[PDB]
Amino acid sequence: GPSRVRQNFHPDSEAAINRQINLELYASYVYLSMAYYFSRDDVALNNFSRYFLHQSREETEHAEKLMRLQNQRGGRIRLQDIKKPEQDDWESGLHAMECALLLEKNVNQSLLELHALASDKGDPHLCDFLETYYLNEQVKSIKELGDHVHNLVKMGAPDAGLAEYLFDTHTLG
Amino acid sequence: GPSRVRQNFHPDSEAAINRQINLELYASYVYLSMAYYFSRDDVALNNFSRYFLHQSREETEHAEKLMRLQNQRGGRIRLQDIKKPEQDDWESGLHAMECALLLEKNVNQSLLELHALASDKGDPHLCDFLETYYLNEQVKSIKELGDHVHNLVKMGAPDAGLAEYLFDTHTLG
Amino acid sequence: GPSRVRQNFHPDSEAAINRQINLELYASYVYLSMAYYFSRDDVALNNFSRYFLHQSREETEHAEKLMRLQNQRGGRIRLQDIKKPEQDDWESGLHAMECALLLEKNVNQSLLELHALASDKGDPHLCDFLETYYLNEQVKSIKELGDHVHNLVKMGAPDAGLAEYLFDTHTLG
Amino acid sequence: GPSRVRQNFHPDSEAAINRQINLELYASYVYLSMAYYFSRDDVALNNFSRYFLHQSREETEHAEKLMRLQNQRGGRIRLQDIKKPEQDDWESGLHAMECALLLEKNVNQSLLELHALASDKGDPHLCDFLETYYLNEQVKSIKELGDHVHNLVKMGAPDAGLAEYLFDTHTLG
Amino acid sequence: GPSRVRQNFHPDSEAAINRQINLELYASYVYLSMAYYFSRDDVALNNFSRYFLHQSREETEHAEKLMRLQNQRGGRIRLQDIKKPEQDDWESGLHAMECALLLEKNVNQSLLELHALASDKGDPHLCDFLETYYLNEQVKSIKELGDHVHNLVKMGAPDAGLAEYLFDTHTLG
Amino acid sequence: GPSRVRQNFHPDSEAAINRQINLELYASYVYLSMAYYFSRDDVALNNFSRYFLHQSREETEHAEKLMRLQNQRGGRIRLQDIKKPEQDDWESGLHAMECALLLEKNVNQSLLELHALASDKGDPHLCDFLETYYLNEQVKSIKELGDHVHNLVKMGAPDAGLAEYLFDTHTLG
Ligand SMILES: [Cl-]
Ligand SMILES: [Cl-]
Ligand SMILES: [Cl-]
Ligand SMILES: [Cl-]
Ligand SMILES: [Cl-]
Ligand SMILES: [Cl-]
Ligand SMILES: [Cl-]
Ligand SMILES: [Cl-]
Ligand SMILES: [Cl-]
Ligand SMILES: [Cl-]
Ligand SMILES: [Cl-]
Ligand SMILES: [Cl-]
Ligand SMILES: [Cl-]
Ligand SMILES: [Cl-]
Ligand SMILES: [Cl-]
Ligand SMILES: [Cl-]
Ligand SMILES: [Cl-]
Ligand SMILES: [Cl-]
Ligand SMILES: [Cl-]
Ligand SMILES: [Cl-]
Ligand SMILES: [Cl-]
Ligand SMILES: [Cl-]
Ligand SMILES: [Cl-]
Ligand SMILES: [Cl-]
Ligand SMILES: [Cl-]
Ligand SMILES: [Cl-]
Ligand SMILES: [Cl-]
Ligand SMILES: [Cl-]
Ligand SMILES: [Cl-]
Ligand SMILES: [Cl-]
Ligand SMILES: [Cl-]
Ligand SMILES: [Cl-]
Ligand SMILES: [Cl-]
Ligand SMILES: [Fe+2]
Ligand SMILES: [Fe+2]
Ligand SMILES: [Fe+2]
Ligand SMILES: [Fe+2]
Ligand SMILES: [Fe+2]
Ligand SMILES: [Fe+2]
Ligand SMILES: [Fe+2]
Ligand SMILES: [Fe+2]
Ligand SMILES: [Fe+2]
Ligand SMILES: [Fe+2]
Ligand SMILES: [Fe+2]
Ligand SMILES: [Fe+2]
Ligand SMILES: [Fe+2]
Ligand SMILES: [Fe+2]
Ligand SMILES: [Fe+2]
Ligand SMILES: [Fe+2]
Ligand SMILES: [Fe+2]
Ligand SMILES: [Fe+2]
Ligand SMILES: [Fe+2]
Ligand SMILES: [Fe+2]
Ligand SMILES: [Fe+2]
Ligand SMILES: [Fe+2]
Ligand SMILES: [Fe+2]
Ligand SMILES: [Fe+2]
Ligand SMILES: [Fe+2]
Ligand SMILES: [Fe+2]
Ligand SMILES: [Fe+2]
Ligand SMILES: [Fe+2]
Ligand SMILES: [Fe+2]
Ligand SMILES: [Fe+2]
Ligand SMILES: [Fe+2]
Ligand SMILES: [Fe+2]
Ligand SMILES: [Fe+2]
Ligand SMILES: [Fe+2]
Ligand SMILES: [Fe+2]
Ligand SMILES: [Fe+2]
Ligand SMILES: [Fe+2]
Ligand SMILES: [Fe+2]
Ligand SMILES: [Fe+2]
Ligand SMILES: [Fe+2]
Ligand SMILES: [Fe+2]
Ligand SMILES: [Fe+2]
Ligand SMILES: [Fe+2]
Ligand SMILES: [Fe+2]
Ligand SMILES: [Fe+2]
Ligand SMILES: [Fe+2]
Ligand SMILES: [Fe+2]
Ligand SMILES: [Fe+2]
Ligand SMILES: [Fe+2]
Ligand SMILES: [Mg+2]
Ligand SMILES: [Mg+2]
Ligand SMILES: [Mg+2]
Ligand SMILES: [Mg+2]
Ligand SMILES: [Mg+2]
Ligand SMILES: [Mg+2]
Ligand SMILES: [Mg+2]
Ligand SMILES: [Mg+2]
Ligand SMILES: [Mg+2]
Ligand SMILES: [Mg+2]
Ligand SMILES: [Mg+2]
Ligand SMILES: [Mg+2]
Ligand SMILES: [Mg+2]
Ligand SMILES: [Mg+2]
Ligand SMILES: [Mg+2]
Ligand SMILES: [Mg+2]
Ligand SMILES: [Mg+2]
Ligand SMILES: [Mg+2]
């Protein structure tokens, strides 16, 4: 138009926010896939299921806050296909945790690149938005997943018969 | 394996449930797109936004109940890409309502075909599942959208300046 | 003295904060003028009046937080005349909303320049202060005013006899 | 128009009310300046600060009641620049109290002149308004400031090191 | 390893965080020393004691939040000796306040250098951490100590017999 | 002076109390180090972390009660550097427990020597202070750590993958 609200909002930032929306929705879909893997009759780790379902819902929240930001700043949301996850069968509780850790690091890297772009374009509102709602959340998530991976490895997952069962009930319970 | 739980569950039913999961997730994405269209600064119909956001969340619930059914019956969830909606700019409150009505009829037709398949395969559990949780929900949704379309048309949407504003505040408020 | 508290606080930042204080007080005065325009017997839109009176009080808060910052950092407040608003008769609810939107964008631009100055002077405390309390508040205010302008335009304000009356009662009520 | 509400309201009264509005806003600004003087790190008398901030807010109330009166009687508010206070550095708690006393007497004199004008123009509504809301308030304010000045003088302010500190905590606390 | 959680975290930042941990623990020890100075039988200013004990506990909190950050980011905490304070006998309430002010400015300078390092290394998570939890806290602490120093100087501390006694009971009480 | 409060308080006792203060602060620092070892991403035993953090806070309390005693008896606190712990990486939950047990025995021995000194100097107040607040606390702490070491050894820590995990959740939880 430009939008009557738009101010100090670079087209490159608008496009990068659209890409980030897609990535957050993708992460939501990965965790939804994991949640329902753990409720298979031949897996049946209900607290792993609940843990990943919660993570899925959080990622949808992350996508929505970026969609709201786009509108607030006068950009236009452009949605793209949400790609299916890389797997349907996630192999084990440990493997799912390791894949989640890799996913979160990848999302973090994208957010850091978005922050660098916002800095380059002199957009302190966008920088603050990412710092306030995204960057520390990512650090906490990565740390949590790292803790979980360590405990599962030490306990002898996936092959030690009691490991994932006991972690399911005592850590994720 | 087959799954140690699987009984009277035809592979064609399992595949059709996977297709229905994708369609429910697609419908969820369409309504999410609509929700954020109505919160654009140049649209700003907050109760249309809230209405479609609620519909989006309901469709995710519909997808999840089918995913649970797949696990309950011993089938294996196979996720596919969630296609982007046909539009980002939904034009008006009336146009969004008309598109939602068409979407719901299309989803209904898919559910009726799923029911016919389940009947052909002598799967009364699957027939009952669809009747109990899907078919009446669809009829109620289609009727509601039909009511909304009629009122918006009669009020003179989209061109009559007061129509969508007043419908937003008095029907969807 | 310098102040026994002063540290990493550039004289240019101190002066720019004094200018921003004046601009926030000016904005408060503009909105006070608008508030009392809407309570004229020949205007009588009481919820427009209340809306702008609230905005006026918020701007005084914005001025006071900067005055507090000046003291906290060891700068010295230097007040200047508060210029009268550009108009006493604000013409219509739509015109007042459009003028408020322009005012908020102008204040935003001043805040962005203040942030750039603070960045240039390596003052992260001042940068954070602006990000935490000012920049997102401005984005939200501009978006809100944009929403209001759009609805009033679409409804046919100012000439459509029902438009401002109905917006007063249903949006600002 | 004249206003369809206007009755027995002389143009000279309308103009004098506009002048009084400006004077009340000026007094509000003087007291805001004083409030933030007392929160300087090299002054730090927090109850003097709170006392003057309260007085500032009361003066804005006084301005608003006159603005409301203008509208009630069918006059038209005409705002003018709010002049900056005569000082930024108010020297001491005693000096600020003495300046406040002088300010209140000056405002009182203006109100008495307004009352004499209203009497001359046979406007008993305006006379009653001033008597009901302004004249006794002024007498109480002047008396309070006189009490405070006397105690601070007797205690040995500003040079006696304990005087303003102890008055801050025990009278204004 | 590197740590499986580590991302965008420069070794220089990790080392600087270890140095800051030591400095916060040092500040905690200085304030603990001051707290117990004021409870000597020949000093006996119990509210000065309580004030510095509270400051001591806050500094331990500051150290712990940095230790947590180190773990969150995948760095490794490296503790060093906590040096004893420069004095055991802090001379007077005024002298302790002046020493605390100098200490807080020194800690602030270290935090500003840490922020500049984090900026140089493109670590927005670390920048935000310092802005959110440290930089404004320091500004508030320095301002508070400046206020206290001013009042004690004006009251005639340390030699005026009533000054520290009255400040203890009325400001710190 | 001597202190006007000092009575039956030998200079050797005063010096020994200063040494004990340092040792209690050292023990506090050892346990703080252990607490944050257990929250590393590659250790992640949160109840070991909480257990040692609590022990750290208790040791600071032990130091403060001796500092208070020094003042109560008219002695003068003389603080010294707090040496860093012997390790940053505490190897395992069992190793940390074994090191804590050794530390507590060492502190106990110092307290017994202090008691023998107080007895030699005919200071029954000091003897009672140590008996009332220190000696039984030490016996309880040593016994608790001995219990924990035994269970961890029997369970097969540190190499048995489930041992420290299960002890963390069921004993320290
Ligand atoms: Cl722009
Ligand atoms: Cl795509
Ligand atoms: Cl920037
Ligand atoms: Cl864990
Ligand atoms: Cl590991
Ligand atoms: Cl167990
Ligand atoms: Cl079957
Ligand atoms: Cl596809
Ligand atoms: Cl059947
Ligand atoms: Cl309807
Ligand atoms: Cl129709
Ligand atoms: Cl209506
Ligand atoms: Cl400076
Ligand atoms: Cl000017
Ligand atoms: Cl900076
Ligand atoms: Cl609106
Ligand atoms: Cl528009
Ligand atoms: Cl008249
Ligand atoms: Cl003027
Ligand atoms: Cl009269
Ligand atoms: Cl008085
Ligand atoms: Cl007098
Ligand atoms: Cl007193
Ligand atoms: Cl790294
Ligand atoms: Cl050292
Ligand atoms: Cl950065
Ligand atoms: Cl103070
Ligand atoms: Cl001073
Ligand atoms: Cl003695
Ligand atoms: Cl030493
Ligand atoms: Cl004895
Ligand atoms: Cl035990
Ligand atoms: Cl044993
Ligand atoms: Fe999470
Ligand atoms: Fe959550
Ligand atoms: Fe996310
Ligand atoms: Fe694909
Ligand atoms: Fe794997
Ligand atoms: Fe995530
Ligand atoms: Fe920044
Ligand atoms: Fe921030
Ligand atoms: Fe997360
Ligand atoms: Fe619905
Ligand atoms: Fe619903
Ligand atoms: Fe559906
Ligand atoms: Fe496509
Ligand atoms: Fe259409
Ligand atoms: Fe539907
Ligand atoms: Fe529905
Ligand atoms: Fe209505
Ligand atoms: Fe506002
Ligand atoms: Fe507000
Ligand atoms: Fe503002
Ligand atoms: Fe002018
Ligand atoms: Fe206009
Ligand atoms: Fe504003
Ligand atoms: Fe605002
Ligand atoms: Fe007053
Ligand atoms: Fe009052
Ligand atoms: Fe007044
Ligand atoms: Fe002037
Ligand atoms: Fe004076
Ligand atoms: Fe007054
Ligand atoms: Fe008054
Ligand atoms: Fe007193
Ligand atoms: Fe503090
Ligand atoms: Fe505190
Ligand atoms: Fe600190
Ligand atoms: Fe030394
Ligand atoms: Fe000194
Ligand atoms: Fe500090
Ligand atoms: Fe502090
Ligand atoms: Fe203990
Ligand atoms: Fe305890
Ligand atoms: Fe101890
Ligand atoms: Fe050493
Ligand atoms: Fe060992
Ligand atoms: Fe101990
Ligand atoms: Fe004894
Ligand atoms: Fe005893
Ligand atoms: Fe203990
Ligand atoms: Fe258990
Ligand atoms: Mg326009
Ligand atoms: Mg992508
Ligand atoms: Mg479940
Ligand atoms: Mg079998
Ligand atoms: Mg399909
Ligand atoms: Mg909304
Ligand atoms: Mg000095
Ligand atoms: Mg200006
Ligand atoms: Mg009103
Ligand atoms: Mg007429
Ligand atoms: Mg005047
Ligand atoms: Mg104050
Ligand atoms: Mg690995
Ligand atoms: Mg150092
Ligand atoms: Mg005490
Ligand atoms: Mg004597
Ligand atoms: Mg020693
Ligand atoms: Mg913990």
PDB file of C-alpha atoms in Angstrom, chain D residues 14 56 65 76 83 89 97-99 105 108 117 122 125 127 139 149 165-166 168:
ATOM      1  CA  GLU D  14     -15.793  32.049  27.956  1.00  0.00           C
ATOM      2  CA  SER D  56       0.542  18.310  40.017  1.00  0.00           C
ATOM      3  CA  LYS D  65     -13.171  20.625  35.430  1.00  0.00           C
ATOM      4  CA  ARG D  76     -15.373  26.493  22.934  1.00  0.00           C
ATOM      5  CA  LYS D  83       4.867  27.718  29.477  1.00  0.00           C
ATOM      6  CA  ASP D  89      16.568  23.429  39.957  1.00  0.00           C
ATOM      7  CA  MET D  97       7.327  25.375  49.286  1.00  0.00           C
ATOM      8  CA  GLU D  98       7.721  29.166  49.108  1.00  0.00           C
ATOM      9  CA  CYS D  99       7.419  29.113  45.309  1.00  0.00           C
ATOM     10  CA  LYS D 105      -1.791  32.961  45.667  1.00  0.00           C
ATOM     11  CA  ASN D 108      -6.236  32.447  43.669  1.00  0.00           C
ATOM     12  CA  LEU D 117     -16.234  39.014  36.068  1.00  0.00           C
ATOM     13  CA  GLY D 122     -24.858  38.167  36.156  1.00  0.00           C
ATOM     14  CA  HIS D 125     -23.967  29.365  37.722  1.00  0.00           C
ATOM     15  CA  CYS D 127     -20.069  32.145  40.456  1.00  0.00           C
ATOM     16  CA  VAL D 139      -7.743  28.759  50.714  1.00  0.00           C
ATOM     17  CA  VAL D 149       6.841  27.037  55.188  1.00  0.00           C
ATOM     18  CA  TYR D 165      15.225  15.335  56.069  1.00  0.00           C
ATOM     19  CA  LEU D 166      13.135  15.253  59.248  1.00  0.00           C
ATOM     20  CA  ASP D 168      10.231  14.914  54.731  1.00  0.00           C
TER      21      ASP D 168
END
